[PDB]
Amino acid sequence: YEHVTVIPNTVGVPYKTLVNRPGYSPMVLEMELLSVTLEPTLSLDYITCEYKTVIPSPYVKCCGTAECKDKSLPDYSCKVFTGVYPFMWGGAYCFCDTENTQLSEAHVEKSESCKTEFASAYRAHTASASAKLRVLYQGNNVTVSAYANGDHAVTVKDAKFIVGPMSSAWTPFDNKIVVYKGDVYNMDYPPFGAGRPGQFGDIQSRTPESEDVYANTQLVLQRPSAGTVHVPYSQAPSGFKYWLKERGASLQHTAPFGCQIATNPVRAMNCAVGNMPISIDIPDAAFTRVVDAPSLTDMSCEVPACTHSSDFGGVAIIKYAASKKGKCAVHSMTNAVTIREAEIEVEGNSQLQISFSTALASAEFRVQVCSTQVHCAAECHPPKDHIVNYPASHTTLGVQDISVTAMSWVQKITGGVGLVVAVAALILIVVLCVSFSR
Amino acid sequence: YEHVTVIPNTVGVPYKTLVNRPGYSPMVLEMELLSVTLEPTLSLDYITCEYKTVIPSPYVKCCGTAECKDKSLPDYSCKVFTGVYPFMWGGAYCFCDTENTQLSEAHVEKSESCKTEFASAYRAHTASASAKLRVLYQGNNVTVSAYANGDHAVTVKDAKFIVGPMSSAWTPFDNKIVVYKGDVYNMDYPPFGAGRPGQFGDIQSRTPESEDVYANTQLVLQRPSAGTVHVPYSQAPSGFKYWLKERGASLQHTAPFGCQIATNPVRAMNCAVGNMPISIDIPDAAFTRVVDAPSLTDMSCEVPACTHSSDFGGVAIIKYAASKKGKCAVHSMTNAVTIREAEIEVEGNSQLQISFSTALASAEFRVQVCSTQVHCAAECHPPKDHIVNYPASHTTLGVQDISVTAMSWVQKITGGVGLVVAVAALILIVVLCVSFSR
C-alpha cells in the first residue's frame, strides 16, 4: 500500500504519522533522520605547501671574474660579488689578496614534505544529497540508506522507501574553499599564478605530483660577509607556515544551522534547514481488516497532569469498552500535540495510559485510537528547570492564534466594547433617519 | 613596458594593436587565438550498457511439484509450470504422462561488453577556459598557452603575457549530458533507479566496475510449448542497443556558435562568442628613442584601387620623405579599415605601398605611420564573387550611420525641406508679430 508524507530536516527527532488504508485498521509509523549528508563536487585549482630554497655551493673564481648566467628555475636569482678574500681553516683560499670574485645562485622548490604537509584550494559546485533513516512499524525497527533524488527506491523486509529532494538548497561551502586535513575553510584564495609573497599561495602547484611550480617568494641574494665562504640571502618566510598559525576556526565550528563538517570526501552533515518528503510502500499483508480490529467504543479521556516540558510532560488516561483482545493504534489529530506511544493492547471494559508533549498552556486535542476518536482537554503548567540538552519534541506554538482557554477575557472585553459601539451606531442611525424624514 | 587590449573571441582571425610608449618610436603587435577550450566539470551519475539475461537450465521435477526459492538478484523472476511432458532425443524424460512440473528462473546482469560498449551519464558543472595564442612583434612569431583566468602570467622570449577572464559564461553543454565515445549529447536522462523498460537507462550502475546493477527489463517467463525442454520468455529489448540506432546527431554537428566538441576529457573548442581581454608586458629593450627614429615628413596618400572584399581588397601608396633608413610602424586609426602590414622600413624621398580590408563603400581613414598621421581616401567597388571560404578580415559596418560619400543627396533634400520649413515658420512669426502689434 502506497503512503506519502513530509518530515522536517532535523536529525535525531522522531516524526510520527498515521497510515489510514480504506477498509483496514489504521497503524502508526515513526521515522527519524539518522544522518543527512550534503557532498559538493570539487574542482582542484592548486596545492600549496612549504617551499625549500636550494643553494648550491658557491663558485669562487680566484684571480678573475666568474661570468654570471641565466637558468629557467621557478624563482631563480643570481649575483657575482667582487673583492672577496675567503679564508678556510688552513689559510686564505685565493692565490691573490684581491681581484677574486664569488658567483652565487639560488632557486625555490617544493619541499620533500609536500606529499603529506600541504593544503588544497578547490572550487566547490552543487552537491549530491544523501540520507540515512530509521523507521518503526508493528515492532519492526528497521534502517534504510538512500540518495535524496526522489527515486532510487530501496526495498527492505518487502517494504519499499523513496526520499527527497529536500526543499532547502542551502549549503555551508562557499564557491571557493581550502582544505588542510579535517579542517576546511571558506576563503577567497588568490587564483593560480596570482599569489603574493608571505601569504597563502606564495608557492603553488597544479597537482601534488606536478613539476610546474609557481613561486613568488621575493628571494634576494646579499653580499657575502668579510673573509667568509657562506651565501647570505633574504626571502619572505613560507606563506603556508604562517597560514597554519593564523588560520582560526574551520567550518566545523563557524558554520550556520548546527552542521558538522568532514573530509575525504568533503561533506556537510546534519544541517537543520528545510524539510524532506518521503514515500513508503508497506506490504498489503501487514494490515488487519477493519472488522478484525478490537472494535472499541464509549471512550472518555482524563488528564492527571500536564506540563509543557519540551518532552512528554503530559500524561492521560483513556477509558474504553472493547469487544475482544486486539492490538490497537493511537495518534493525535492536532499538530500542536505530539504523543509518545504508537500502538497498544486493549481488551474488555477498562482504561489505558498515554504520554504526550505540547507548547500549549491549555491542551485541547483529539486522540484517534483504532478507527475511533475521543476528545481530550486539560490545563498545562509551565516546566521549572530552564535550559535542557535536547530539541523540543513538538511543533512551535501559533503565538498569534492559540492563546489559552481562560483567555476568554479577550472575548469578554471585545463584546464589552463592541456592544458599546453597536448601541452608539444604532442611536446615530435613529436620529439620522428622523433628520432625513422631516 | 605594459600594454592592455581586448580582442573578439573568434579563432583563427588575426587582430592588430599599436604599442605606444611615450618618447619611443611605436611598434605594432599582431595576435591570433589559435584555439580556445572550455572544459566542463563532470560528476558521473551512472554507466549504462547492453544487459545480458542469465537463464540457468530448468529444474524439472518428475512426479511432483517444484517450488520457488526467492533470491534478491537484479531483475529476478521465477515461475512453475504444470502438466509438462518433455521429450529428449531418445524418449520421454519424465517417468509418467502428467503430474510433472518445470521450475523456470532467470535474471539480468551487465553484459561482459561493459568495459568497451557503454555510455556515461554526467552532470556538467561550470567550465574552466584554456587558450592557445600566437603573437608577433620585432619580426618574430611567438606562441603561448595559458588558463584564461585573467591573472596566470606566462613569460616567453623575455616578454610576459596574461589573458582573460572570458567575457561570457555561455557553454554548449546542458546541465546533464551523456557521452559514448567521441559523441556527446545534451539529454534529460532518467535519474538512477528511474529507468523504464526498452529505453536509455533500462539498466544502470554507478561505475563500470561496480555491482550495484539497477535494471528494469520487464522480463516475464512463458509456459513451455508441448513436449519441449526450453525456457521461453518476453523482455523489453536492451534499450542501449536501440539508443545506438535512434541516436540523432552529436553536439559536434548541432551546437551553436560554430564550436567543435571532443572527448578525453570532454571539451568545447573555438566557440565564437564574447571577447578576450589581454595584457602584454614586452621588454624595454625592444624600443628605440623617437629622437633617433627615421620620423617621416611630407606624407601624401593615394589609393589606386579598392574593393570591400572579405580579404585585403584595397591598396594604398604613400609618397614620403624620411631623414635616414630605419624601421617604421603602420596602424589604422579607423575601426572600419584594417591594415595588413605592421612594421615596415623606410628611407630617403620615395613611396611605399600597403594593403587594407574594409566594409566601407567610400573609404576615408587616417593612417598612423611612424609617430605621425596622414589622411587617406577612396571609392570602393563591390566584390564580384558571392560566397567565400573564410571569415571577414574587417570589422562589421556601423550601418546605423556609416555610409557612402555621395550621401550628400541626404544633405540636399534635408537642407531643402529644412529651408522650406524655416521660411514658412519665419513668415508665420513675422505675420504673428504684426497681428500681435494690433
Side-chain angles (χ1 to χ4, degrees):
Chain A
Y1 179 74
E2 177 78 347
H3 183 77
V4 61
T5 191
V6 181
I7 70 176
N9 192 27
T10 296
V11 166
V13 181
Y15 295 106
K16 174 149 41 203
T17 193
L18 186 73
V19 182
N20 180 240
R21 179 176 179 200
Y24 286 82
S25 63
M27 68 165 73
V28 171
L29 300 176
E30 66 163 51
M31 57 280 290
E32 59 190 310
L33 294 166
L34 297 188
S35 170
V36 172
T37 302
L38 281 73
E39 183 179 348
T41 308
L42 302 317
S43 299
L44 168 57
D45 288 345
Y46 58 89
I47 299 304
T48 305
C49 55
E50 183 169 359
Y51 71 77
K52 64 172 180 175
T53 183
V54 180
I55 307 189
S57 294
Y59 177 71
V60 70
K61 191 75 163 184
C62 295
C63 319
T65 54
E67 70 178 37
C68 190
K69 89 297 185 174
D70 181 37
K71 205 177 291 182
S72 313
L73 312 187
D75 202 357
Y76 177 92
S77 187
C78 177
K79 276 187 165 60
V80 177
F81 300 101
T82 185
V84 304
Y85 187 55
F87 294 84
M88 297 185 72
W89 65 262
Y93 182 90
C94 301
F95 309 96
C96 63
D97 315 60
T98 188
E99 314 206 308
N100 314 298
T101 63
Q102 168 171 331
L103 175 64
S104 296
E105 61 204 311
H107 65 280
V108 308
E109 302 191 343
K110 293 184 310 186
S111 299
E112 317 310 327
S113 62
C114 311
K115 303 302 199 298
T116 297
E117 287 297 332
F118 68 87
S120 307
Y122 295 168
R123 284 166 295 113
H125 311 297
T126 200
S128 304
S130 173
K132 190 72 158 286
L133 177 146
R134 186 186 75 87
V135 58
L136 176 61
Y137 84 99
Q138 309 302 81
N140 306 278
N141 191 16
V142 71
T143 302
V144 64
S145 181
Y147 277 70
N149 73 5
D151 290 297
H152 184 25
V154 185
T155 182
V156 56
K157 293 187 173 184
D158 301 358
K160 175 173 60 71
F161 300 89
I162 297 167
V163 310
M166 312 85 64
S167 50
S168 51
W170 178 86
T171 187
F173 303 108
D174 200 356
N175 291 266
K176 300 268 284 288
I177 70 180
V178 176
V179 336
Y180 174 53
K181 296 186 185 180
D183 292 308
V184 47
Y185 295 90
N186 288 345
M187 71 169 287
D188 190 15
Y189 61 80
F192 186 70
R196 261 72 72 153
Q199 301 183 35
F200 184 72
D202 64 327
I203 174 169
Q204 301 181 31
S205 178
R206 292 303 309 194
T207 74
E209 61 183 343
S210 185
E211 297 160 32
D212 71 340
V213 179
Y214 168 76
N216 186 226
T217 71
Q218 80 128 100
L219 173 60
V220 173
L221 303 185
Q222 295 197 348
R223 182 60 163 64
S225 67
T228 306
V229 289
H230 76 139
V231 181
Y233 68 97
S234 171
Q235 189 178 25
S238 174
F240 181 63
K241 286 271 279 184
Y242 286 178
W243 180 78
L244 291 181
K245 295 189 177 184
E246 293 184 346
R247 55 194 174 115
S250 61
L251 291 165
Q252 170 55 8
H253 312 289
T254 66
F257 296 102
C259 66
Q260 303 293 321
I261 308 294
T263 61
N264 53 246
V266 175
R267 287 164 285 162
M269 302 185 291
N270 311 337
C271 309
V273 66
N275 62 359
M276 186 163 210
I278 70 178
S279 307
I280 91 291
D281 174 25
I282 55 178
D284 296 350
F287 298 84
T288 57
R289 304 179 300 159
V290 70
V291 300
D292 301 334
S295 184
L296 82 176
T297 193
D298 195 21
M299 293 184 285
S300 70
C301 191
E302 162 69 321
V303 182
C306 191
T307 301
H308 39 290
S309 305
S310 295
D311 61 27
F312 309 107
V315 65
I317 296 162
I318 294 162
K319 312 298 187 170
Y320 72 90
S323 76
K324 60 184 175 185
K325 169 68 78 167
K327 187 70 84 70
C328 180
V330 298
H331 187 251
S332 173
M333 294 301 304
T334 54
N335 305 315
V337 179
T338 61
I339 188 165
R340 190 181 66 188
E341 308 310 321
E343 42 68 60
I344 59 179
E345 290 196 3
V346 298
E347 74 165 44
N349 178 97
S350 192
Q351 57 85 2
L352 67 90
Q353 284 187 336
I354 60 167
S355 305
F356 68 93
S357 189
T358 184
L360 298 167
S362 61
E364 299 190 319
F365 61 102
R366 291 182 309 293
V367 180
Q368 176 71 1
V369 303
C370 188
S371 307
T372 318
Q373 201 157 125
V374 63
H375 186 77
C376 181
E379 314 304 14
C380 175
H381 305 289
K384 301 187 71 70
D385 294 352
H386 312 291
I387 310 309
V388 281
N389 299 113
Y390 43 83
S393 309
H394 60 77
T395 315
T396 190
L397 185 67
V399 64
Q400 303 188 17
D401 61 336
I402 327 182
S403 304
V404 291
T405 48
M407 105 320 177
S408 58
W409 287 105
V410 174
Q411 293 178 3
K412 190 179 185 293
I413 75 180
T414 297
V417 73
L419 293 176
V420 171
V421 174
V423 170
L426 182 64
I427 285 173
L428 184 64
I429 285 161
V430 169
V431 303
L432 181 63
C433 178
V434 307
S435 83
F436 295 146
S437 301
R438 297 189 295 201
Chain B
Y1 179 80
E2 189 270 322
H3 185 76
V4 67
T5 191
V6 186
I7 68 176
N9 180 30
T10 292
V11 167
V13 176
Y15 293 97
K16 209 82 70 160
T17 188
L18 180 62
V19 154
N20 182 233
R21 184 181 179 205
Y24 293 80
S25 55
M27 76 177 83
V28 165
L29 268 281
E30 181 184 295
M31 63 276 293
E32 178 187 351
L33 289 166
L34 299 180
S35 69
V36 66
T37 309
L38 306 179
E39 181 178 326
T41 301
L42 264 57
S43 177
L44 172 62
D45 281 350
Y46 55 89
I47 300 306
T48 77
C49 49
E50 172 155 25
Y51 65 64
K52 69 175 192 279
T53 184
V54 182
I55 303 185
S57 310
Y59 179 65
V60 41
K61 181 72 180 84
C62 299
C63 319
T65 60
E67 62 195 312
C68 173
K69 300 180 189 291
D70 193 18
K71 51 192 169 190
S72 57
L73 305 176
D75 200 358
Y76 189 63
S77 287
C78 183
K79 209 74 171 186
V80 181
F81 306 115
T82 178
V84 304
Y85 188 62
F87 296 90
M88 290 184 68
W89 71 262
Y93 180 74
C94 298
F95 174 57
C96 62
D97 315 52
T98 186
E99 315 199 332
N100 311 299
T101 54
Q102 167 176 329
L103 182 147
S104 307
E105 61 183 315
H107 66 282
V108 315
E109 302 188 356
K110 286 187 296 182
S111 188
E112 310 312 328
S113 319
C114 312
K115 297 89 167 185
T116 308
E117 292 300 336
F118 69 94
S120 177
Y122 289 103
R123 309 200 76 106
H125 310 291
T126 194
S128 64
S130 176
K132 184 70 175 288
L133 179 146
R134 177 182 73 85
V135 52
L136 165 61
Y137 74 103
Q138 282 284 97
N140 282 262
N141 279 298
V142 69
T143 183
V144 66
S145 182
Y147 289 84
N149 75 359
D151 288 290
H152 175 33
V154 185
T155 303
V156 61
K157 287 288 185 286
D158 212 8
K160 171 166 49 74
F161 305 89
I162 115 182
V163 58
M166 188 103 298
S167 74
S168 62
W170 184 90
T171 295
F173 309 105
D174 280 347
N175 197 253
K176 294 198 307 289
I177 68 181
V178 318
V179 313
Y180 173 50
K181 298 185 184 182
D183 309 354
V184 48
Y185 301 87
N186 289 333
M187 63 174 281
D188 194 20
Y189 60 75
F192 187 70
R196 297 168 295 274
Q199 298 188 4
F200 180 76
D202 70 340
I203 174 163
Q204 303 169 318
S205 176
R206 303 299 298 280
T207 81
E209 62 193 306
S210 178
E211 297 194 327
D212 64 359
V213 184
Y214 170 79
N216 186 14
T217 64
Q218 76 164 2
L219 171 60
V220 300
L221 290 147
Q222 290 162 230
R223 189 175 181 283
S225 67
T228 310
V229 217
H230 70 291
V231 179
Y233 67 96
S234 284
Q235 182 181 227
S238 169
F240 176 71
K241 288 284 283 180
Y242 291 153
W243 182 83
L244 289 186
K245 289 178 169 283
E246 300 181 316
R247 206 187 305 177
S250 182
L251 296 178
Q252 186 173 30
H253 308 299
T254 77
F257 294 107
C259 67
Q260 279 296 339
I261 286 171
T263 66
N264 295 338
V266 323
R267 288 160 293 128
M269 296 175 288
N270 313 334
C271 306
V273 63
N275 67 22
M276 186 75 98
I278 292 169
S279 170
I280 97 285
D281 180 13
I282 49 176
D284 299 355
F287 296 85
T288 289
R289 310 187 301 169
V290 72
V291 303
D292 301 327
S295 189
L296 279 74
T297 195
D298 213 15
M299 304 83 71
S300 302
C301 280
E302 180 171 25
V303 186
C306 191
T307 67
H308 45 298
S309 303
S310 303
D311 66 338
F312 298 95
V315 63
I317 307 181
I318 302 184
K319 278 69 173 179
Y320 72 79
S323 57
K324 70 191 73 177
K325 187 170 188 283
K327 312 304 297 197
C328 183
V330 300
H331 183 262
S332 175
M333 303 308 302
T334 305
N335 303 97
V337 180
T338 291
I339 196 76
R340 197 184 69 158
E341 307 311 314
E343 52 187 10
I344 65 177
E345 65 192 67
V346 180
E347 71 182 310
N349 185 328
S350 188
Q351 69 277 171
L352 64 88
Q353 68 178 356
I354 62 187
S355 300
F356 64 90
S357 189
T358 182
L360 298 175
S362 316
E364 290 204 61
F365 63 110
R366 273 182 162 252
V367 179
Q368 183 148 321
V369 300
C370 176
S371 313
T372 56
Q373 293 189 355
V374 61
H375 189 85
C376 196
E379 295 180 7
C380 308
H381 307 115
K384 304 306 178 184
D385 294 345
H386 327 296
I387 309 301
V388 289
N389 308 113
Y390 45 86
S393 312
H394 63 68
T395 312
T396 293
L397 187 64
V399 71
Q400 300 78 13
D401 60 50
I402 306 185
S403 57
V404 293
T405 60
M407 87 316 166
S408 59
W409 281 97
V410 176
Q411 292 193 334
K412 291 181 180 182
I413 75 175
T414 206
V417 174
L419 288 167
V420 78
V421 167
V423 171
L426 176 62
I427 290 296
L428 173 62
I429 288 160
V430 170
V431 306
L432 185 64
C433 197
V434 299
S435 60
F436 174 38
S437 308
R438 281 172 167 57

